[PDB]
Amino acid sequence: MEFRSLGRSGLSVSEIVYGNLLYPQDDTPDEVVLSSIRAALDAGVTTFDTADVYGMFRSESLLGRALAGTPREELVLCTKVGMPTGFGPNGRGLSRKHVMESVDGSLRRLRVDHIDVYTAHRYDPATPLEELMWTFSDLVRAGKILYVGMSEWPVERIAEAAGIGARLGVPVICHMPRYSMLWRAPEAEVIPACRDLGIGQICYFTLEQGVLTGKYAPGAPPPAGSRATAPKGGRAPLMRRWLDDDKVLGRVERLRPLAEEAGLTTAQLALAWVLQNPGVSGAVIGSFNAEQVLANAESAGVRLETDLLVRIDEVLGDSVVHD
Amino acid sequence: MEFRSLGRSGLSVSEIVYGNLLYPQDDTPDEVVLSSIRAALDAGVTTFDTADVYGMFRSESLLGRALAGTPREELVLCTKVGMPTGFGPNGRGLSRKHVMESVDGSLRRLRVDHIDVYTAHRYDPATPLEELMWTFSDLVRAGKILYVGMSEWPVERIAEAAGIGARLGVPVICHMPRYSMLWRAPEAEVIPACRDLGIGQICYFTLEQGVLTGKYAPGAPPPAGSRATAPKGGRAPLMRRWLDDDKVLGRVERLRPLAEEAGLTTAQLALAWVLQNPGVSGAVIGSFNAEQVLANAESAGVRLETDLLVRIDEVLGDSVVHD
Amino acid sequence: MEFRSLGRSGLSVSEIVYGNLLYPQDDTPDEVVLSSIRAALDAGVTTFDTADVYGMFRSESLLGRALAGTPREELVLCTKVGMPTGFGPNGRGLSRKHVMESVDGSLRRLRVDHIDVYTAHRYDPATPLEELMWTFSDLVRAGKILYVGMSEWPVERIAEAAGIGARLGVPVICHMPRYSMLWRAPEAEVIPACRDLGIGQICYFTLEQGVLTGKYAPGAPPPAGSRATAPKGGRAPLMRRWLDDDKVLGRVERLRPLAEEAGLTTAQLALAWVLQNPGVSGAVIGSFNAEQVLANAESAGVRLETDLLVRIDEVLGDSVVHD
Amino acid sequence: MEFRSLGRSGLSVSEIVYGNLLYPQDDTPDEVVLSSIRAALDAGVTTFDTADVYGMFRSESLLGRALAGTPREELVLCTKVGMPTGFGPNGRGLSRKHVMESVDGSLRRLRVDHIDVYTAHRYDPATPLEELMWTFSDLVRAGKILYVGMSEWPVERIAEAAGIGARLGVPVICHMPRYSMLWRAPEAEVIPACRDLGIGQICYFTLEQGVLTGKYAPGAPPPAGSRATAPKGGRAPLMRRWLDDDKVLGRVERLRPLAEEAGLTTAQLALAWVLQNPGVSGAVIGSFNAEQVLANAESAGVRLETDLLVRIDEVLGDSVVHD
Ligand SMILES: NC(=O)c1ccc[n+]([C@@H]2O[C@H](COP(=O)([O-])OP(=O)(O)OC[C@H]3O[C@@H](n4cnc5c(N)ncnc54)[C@H](OP(=O)(O)O)[C@@H]3O)[C@@H](O)[C@H]2O)c1
Ligand SMILES: NC(=O)c1ccc[n+]([C@@H]2O[C@H](COP(=O)([O-])OP(=O)(O)OC[C@H]3O[C@@H](n4cnc5c(N)ncnc54)[C@H](OP(=O)(O)O)[C@@H]3O)[C@@H](O)[C@H]2O)c1
Ligand SMILES: NC(=O)c1ccc[n+]([C@@H]2O[C@H](COP(=O)([O-])OP(=O)(O)OC[C@H]3O[C@@H](n4cnc5c(N)ncnc54)[C@H](OP(=O)(O)O)[C@@H]3O)[C@@H](O)[C@H]2O)c1
Ligand SMILES: NC(=O)c1ccc[n+]([C@@H]2O[C@H](COP(=O)([O-])OP(=O)(O)OC[C@H]3O[C@@H](n4cnc5c(N)ncnc54)[C@H](OP(=O)(O)O)[C@@H]3O)[C@@H](O)[C@H]2O)c1
Incomplete structure (x- = not known):
């Protein structure tokens, strides 16, 4: 495994984050979840990403159990607060009340004294940033959290929060965008701004839910246990955008020669592609298959040639999404 | 139930507060107190207002017991410190000593780790605001209180305290005035000042102790179990001002047609009237009668027409108290 | 009992402090110490003054035991740190180390969660005031102490420490000088400076160890159990200054008519004299005799006439010590 | 024993530190380690220097056990954080994560509530000094550490950290350089800078691993149980520099007359030499021999004549290392 700095901080994360x-109602057995996390550790992954809301507390509980026994110095636990976990209007968002009432349950379920990275899930316009950042100061002083992050935040508001955090001794070191070969919205403004503010990216949908594994053929029936066949949750429509486009699916199939050139699967090429941006500390991978994790983990530290990066842009052409 | 922001904060309160x-020597049985709080929850009330001094600790103890089992994220607990609860000159006021010695008893009696809103009951000229605000900073850092409020405070002193709180990361978000159709002292200066400072009003005597239910006829014997018949405590004289005035009692009776126009009881009209001010986050209701609570709770989110607000002023005329 | 503000603070102390x-090797039985403290409470005394070093922890232990059961809101506990209580050079002074290692033993022996007033005993030139005041900030944040005081401090250094305390949210409200009818060193500079800085005086040797009770006749054998007969500790020489001067002893005897004029014992006149200075919050009294405490306690709130204050100066004349 | 101020602070250390x-794999029996620490206490040593990394936790555990029972006021415990104690990239350095995860193990092994001096072992360029100093602020606020130190740090970075510590109420009072008669690199810049910033030196390799005991003769077989015969660890090469130079070994032998002049062993002269610099608070001594400790301890407070300091420079000549 290769490691990077999360921003201007002393914290190193693995280049591959699980x-x-x-x-909330999911059919994946716990035994399959625990063996995937076990496969991530075997591949040298140190960094784990979760949320209170994932599985409605189940995702954090399973992670807590899988990582029990791993020495604390060897793990970076990233969790999130902001999405609804309680009934009523104080059961969500980034108020002092919701954050204070969230942290202790996250600690219990993960089985730890402190969370390495605590991420404000979504930006919440009701809470002033002075209220939020002082709430984070209190949790850092108490040693319940070490570092602060943000996911899906307007860039003006990232800068503001970084400013206040510098004043209050709150390390704001991490932003979580959607980033892949196909989705490059964050190249325009977010990564340039974040880099100046000492913030690194931990990136999600890096395989666009399997579309960048080359495993979906244009005009075909999708494979046996593929995500296309089992579309649970309101993320299935984000995938439908690409599966209902035989153009993209065919251009993704043409990357395979480029990948084999470099001795990679299309999956490893897509993951290595994200890792080529200096503004990126980590790529998040989803999988409940041990063999997929151990293989996706090997993208860590791979440099792609200038030549291969120019040919990738040519093949994907106008299917790429910018800003 | 409808919810509002308490000031410029992430905290939502119900529009109807119980x-x-x-x-201190009260004949109301506990069983009647517990069933009223139970009726408030059934009506969707999330926000509860009490004080160390109320019942001499009995009011907080009963509330603690009634709300046991309600998830913490679903409640906003507002309590007060400042009125005498101990013997001698340090058993009252807003000194570091009295506040530090008060908070832990309030937490025990309410059965909670933290109080949502901690209100300085009355302004106390002996304590410098620097002493008080640093005492509140220490309680916020410790996570024993989340937000700060004031009740019956000079407006210069609200501004001063808001200023220092912004400097020390103390959210000062709440002021508690007397406010009703008949008592509009806070329209003149308090609500305008508070609105600029990011402070919302949680309002009391909103029915003027039942006078704005239309239930008292001019020149009559007051009903069986009415507050006029059972005048306990030094709040009975504030009511006597209006009951010894057949003029007001007759003008209140003439609102009933205006209420029925809007499909409301006089009580619901009086409560909705307060809620029409943008500076108001919440109206407090008193009652030890389930049927009264469930009915008063339905004023939440009712808009009154411009027409009806002009006709209300005409009927009440010069009985209204301003500044 | 009458009460005063300790400085510009919300803390009230009794005008008579015990x-x-x-x-360290004292023959006074514990039973006599406990009954004196019991007599102080009966006389309405709320404020108690002690030190880690007094009796080598015995003074604090007895006080802790005598006051067990008294409600906490009704007491002001003043203790001191700075005098040697441990072996070696870190077992004394006002270093972060000595103060941090002192506070928990004081709390245990007094049987309390917090000390009302924590007094820096003597000024210590080795420790920078930034180190000391930040150590006091940490103890206030933790709620182990409420207010800070100083005893026998240069006036430049009182001002400096008051300045830093205002910056760090440390209430510096109390100075402890030697002050009596005979010893007026603090009138010159200390009380004027302290009054501008919001600091009140709690005064010691207010009877000059019994010399201002009129109980010592010039050219006589001192009474049976008098302090003159039992000169334990290096405070006996401070008394010898006045007992080896038949002039003063005779001028003190001539105050008795002035006292009887006002319906006071010479002791009550001497105590009331100190309390006439607006810069004084409290006079400390020593006694292990119940009847003396109950009588000395009655000086509280006595005003002396302008006439009597001019005649007192005439009688004592040039025996008075100024600066 | 003689004591000095550690910088501009209230902390006194013994002039001789053990x-x-x-x-990590060492053949020295625990019984020999415990009796050496016992010999240090008997010689009046109050100050003990260790590290998490020394013996891989064994050095701190033995010290904890040897000092159990010694009153806390009588000891100064100096430990270090920064060297690798865990697997992976967060198991080392000065990140919030590594420091937060280190302190509690150091406290447990030493059997104490707080560490007197916490030293940043090596400077770590990955961690910004704002992250580090706020991490130290949190540990001081919590009372887990009292004072902060640095070992082997660039001088620009000492100044920067001292600056931020003054702002955050972190006492930065201590630097640990290599310093002896033969190694004077710190005279050039470090001690002058440190003295202006209120930082004192606790010095190591003060005998250059026994070379300044005069016990190694040029062109000979080194004694029975001498360090030259048992070269464990990567510090043996630093010694080889001097043992492979018959010139130095012969000049060290010629100091013996100068030592006997002053009534000292060559060891006591070398230790007293370091202590002559006003910028030095303490000299660290290594030994697992009781008789060596009790003798080395007697250098404490010895003044050397101007005459003897000029003759020492003449004898050692150009073997001395400067900058
Ligand atoms: N910060 C945020 O707001 C946010 C939002 C969403 C997600 N996230 C995080 O990011 C992660 C994203 O996971 P994701 O699964 O939604 O997106 P993804 O990582 O783009 O997709 C992973 C999926 O692609 C398929 N796949 C991966 N490698 C493969 C291989 N070598 N061969 C064949 N198929 C392969 C697998 O599904 P099948 O084999 O079943 O097709 C796998 O579950 C989440 O786990 C979450 O922790 C964060
Ligand atoms: N911040 C402060 O300093 C402060 C000061 C005072 C009070 N408060 C708070 O504000 C609350 C005010 O309560 P309050 O009772 O004094 O004043 P209120 O709310 O103006 O009066 C409520 C009373 O009016 C009558 N009533 C209400 N709805 C009715 C209906 N639909 N039909 C018939 N009668 C009805 C009831 O008494 P009867 O039926 O018995 O006549 C009821 O107890 C207190 O509970 C307290 O928490 C705060
Ligand atoms: N902050 C500081 O550095 C500092 C320094 C010293 C003391 N103090 C404090 O101040 C206190 C001073 O006590 P102190 O006793 O040294 O000085 P004091 O209060 O001037 O003297 C009290 C003594 O005078 C005699 N006395 C008092 N009232 C009397 C009466 N009505 N009739 C007859 N005799 C009477 C008693 O001794 P006999 O009857 O036995 O003659 C009594 O013990 C101490 O307890 C201590 O807490 C503080
Ligand atoms: N801050 C840092 O980064 C750092 C780095 C290294 C060390 N240190 C500290 O500094 C200490 C340095 O210890 P050190 O032992 O490496 O260097 P040292 O103190 O220069 O050498 C001590 C050694 O010299 C010999 N010796 C001492 N006195 C003697 C006498 N009177 N007669 C004969 N031989 C004598 C002994 O070894 P033999 O008798 O076995 O020859 C003894 O073990 C360590 O314990 C450690 O705590 C700190």
Whole structure:
């Protein structure tokens, strides 16, 4: 495994981060979840990404159990607060109340004294940033959290929060965008801004839910246990955008020669592609298959040639999404 | 139930707040107090107002017991410190000593780790605001209180305290005035000042102790179990001002047609009237009658027409108290 | 009992403070110490003055035991740190180390969660005031102490420490000088400076160890159990200054008519004299005799006429010590 | 024993500090380690120097056990954080994560609530000094550490950290350089800078691993149980520099007359030499021999004549290392 700095900080994360998102009513057995996390550790993954809301507390509980026994110095636990976990209007968002009432349950379920990275899930316009950042100061002073992150935040608001955190001794070191070969919205403004502010990216949908594994053929029936066949949760439509486009699916199939050139699967090429941006500390991978994790983990530290990066842009052409 | 922001904060309160004030020697059975709080929850009330001094600790103890089992994320607990609860000159006021010695008893009696809103009951000229605000900073850092409020405070002193709180990361978000159709002292200066400072009003005597239910006829014997018949405590004289005035009692009776126009009881009209001010986050209701609570709770989110607000002023005329 | 503000603070102290200083090898039985503290409470005394060093922890232990059961809101506990209580050079002074290692033993022996007033005993030139004041900030944040005081401090250094405390949210409200009818060193600079800085005086040797009770006749054998007969500790020489001067002893005897004029014992006149200075919050009294405490306690709130204050100066004349 | 101020602070250290460095696989029995620490206490040593990394936790555990029972006020415990103690890239360095995860193990092994001096072992360029100093602020606020130190740090970075510590109420009072008669690299810049910043030196290799005891003759077989015969760990090469130079070994032998002049062993002269610099608070001594400790301890407070300091420079000549 290769490691990077999360921003201007002393924290190193693995270049490959394991995420274990589950749906509130999910059919994936716990035994399959635990063996995937076990496969991530075997591949040298140190960094784990979860949320209170994932599985409605189940995702954090399973992770807590899988990692019990791993020495604490060897793990970076990233969790999130902001999505609804309680009934009523104080059971969500980034108020002092919701954050204070969230942290202790996250600690219990993960079986730890402190969370390495605590991420504000979504930006919440009701809470002033002075309220939020002082709430984070209190949790850092108490040693319940070490570092702060944000996911899906307007860039003006990232800068503001970084500013206040510098004043209050809150390390704001991490932003979580959607980033892949196909989705490059964050190249325009977010990564340039974040880099100046000492913030690194931990990136999600890096395989666009399997579309960048080359495993979906244009005009075909999708494979046996593929995500296309089992579309649980409101993320299935984000995938439908690409599966209902035989153009993209065919251009993704043409990357395979480029990958084999470099001695990679299409999956490893897509993961290595994200890792080529200096603004990126980590790529998150989803999988409940041990063999997929151990293989996806090997993208860590791979440099792609200037030549191969120019040919990738040519093949994908106008299917790429910018800003 | 409808919810509002308490000031410029992430905290939402219900538009209808339940208060459970008791007298130090009070004849109201506990079973009647517990069933009223139970009726408030059934009506969707999330926000509860009490004080150390109410019932001499009895009011907080009963509330603690009634709300045991309700998830913490679903409640906003507002309590007060400042009124005498101990013997001698340090057993009252807003000194570091009295506040530090008060908070832990409030937490025990309410059965909670933290109080949502901690209100300085009355302004106390002996304590410098620097002493008080640093005492509140220490309680916020420790996570024993989340937000700070004030009740019956000079407006210069609200501004001063808001200023220092912004500097020390103390959210000062709440002021508690007397406010009704008949008592509009806070329109003049308090609500305008508070609105600029990011402070919302949680309002009391919103029915002027039942006078704005239309239930008292000019020149009559007051009903069986009415507050006029059972005048316990030094709040009875504030009511006597209006009951010894057949003029007001007759003008209140003439609102009933205006209420029925809007499909409301006089009580619901009086409560909705307060809620029409943008500076108001919540109206407090007193009652030890389930049927009264469930009915008063339905004023939440009712808009009154411009027409009806002009006709209300005409009927009440010069009985209204301003500044 | 009458009460005063300790400085610009919300803390009230009794005008009569009980001190229980003992010598490291002292013959006074505990039963006599406990009954004196019991007599102080009966006289309405709320404020108690002690030190880690007094009796070598015995003075604090007895006070802790005597006051067990008294409600906490009704007491002001003043203790001191700075005098040697341990072996070696870190077993004394005002270093972070000595103060941090002192506070928990004081709390245990007094049987309390927090000390009302924590006094820096003597000024210590080795420790920078930034180190000391940050150590006091940490103890206030933790709620182990509420207010800070100083005893026998240069006035430049009182001002400096008051300045830093205002910056760090440390209430510096109390100075402890030697002050009596005969010893007026603090009138010159200390009380004027302290009054501008919001600091009140709690005063010691207010009877000059019994010399201002009129109980010592010039050219006589001192009474049976008098302090002159039992000169334990290095405070006996401070008394010898006045007992080896038949002039003063005779001028003190001539105050008795002035006292009887006002319906006071010479002791009550001497105590009331100190309390006439607006810069004074409290006079400390020593006694292990119940009848003396109950009588000395009655000086509280006595105003002396302008006439009587001019005649007192005439009688004592040039025996008075100024600066 | 003689004592000095550690910088501009209230902390006194003994002029002779005992260090107990061990190698991760070391043959020295625990019984020999415990009796050496016992000999240090008997010689009046109050100050003990160790590290998490020394013996891989064994050095701190033995020290913890040897000092159990010694009153806390009588000891200054100096430990270090920064060297690798865990697997992976967060198991080392000065990140919030590594420091937070280190302190509690150091406290447990030493059997104490707080560490007197916490030293950043090596400077770590990955961690910004704002992250580090706020991590130290949190540990001081919590009372887990009292004072902060640095070992082997660039001088620009000492100044920067001292600056931030003054702002955050972190006492930065201590630097640990290599310093002896033969190694004077720190005279050039480090001690002058440190003295202006209120930082004192606790010095190591003060005998250059026994070379300044005069016990190694040029062109000979080194004694029975001498360090030259048993070269464990990567510090043996630093010694080889001097043992492979018959010139130095012969010049060290010629100091013996100068030592006997002053009534000292060559060891006592070398230790007293370091202590002559006003910028030095303490000299660290290594030994697992009781008789060596009790003798080395007697250098404490010895003044050397101007005459003897000029003759020492003449004898050692160009073997001395400067900058
Ligand atoms: N910060 C945020 O707001 C946010 C939002 C969403 C997600 N996330 C995080 O990011 C993660 C994203 O996971 P994701 O699964 O949604 O997106 P993804 O990582 O783009 O997709 C992973 C999926 O692609 C398929 N796949 C991966 N490698 C493969 C291989 N070598 N061969 C064949 N198929 C392969 C697998 O599904 P099948 O084999 O079943 O097709 C796998 O479950 C989540 O776990 C979560 O922790 C964060
Ligand atoms: N911040 C402060 O300093 C402060 C000061 C005072 C009070 N408060 C708070 O505000 C609350 C005010 O309560 P309050 O009772 O004094 O004043 P209120 O809310 O104006 O009066 C409520 C009373 O009016 C009558 N009533 C209400 N709805 C009715 C209906 N639909 N039909 C018939 N009668 C009805 C009831 O008494 P009867 O039926 O018995 O006549 C009821 O107890 C207290 O509980 C307390 O929590 C705060
Ligand atoms: N902050 C500081 O550095 C500091 C320093 C010293 C003391 N103090 C405090 O201040 C206190 C001073 O006590 P102190 O006793 O040294 O000085 P004091 O209060 O001037 O003297 C009290 C003594 O005078 C005699 N006395 C008092 N009232 C009397 C009466 N009505 N009739 C007859 N005799 C009477 C008693 O001794 P006999 O009857 O036995 O003659 C009594 O013990 C101490 O307890 C201590 O807490 C503080
Ligand atoms: N801050 C840092 O980074 C750092 C780095 C290294 C060390 N240190 C500290 O500094 C200490 C340095 O210890 P050190 O032993 O490496 O260097 P040292 O103190 O220069 O050498 C001590 C050694 O010299 C010999 N010796 C001492 N006195 C003697 C006498 N009177 N007669 C004969 N031989 C004598 C002994 O070895 P033999 O008798 O076996 O020859 C003894 O073990 C360590 O314990 C550690 O705590 C700190």
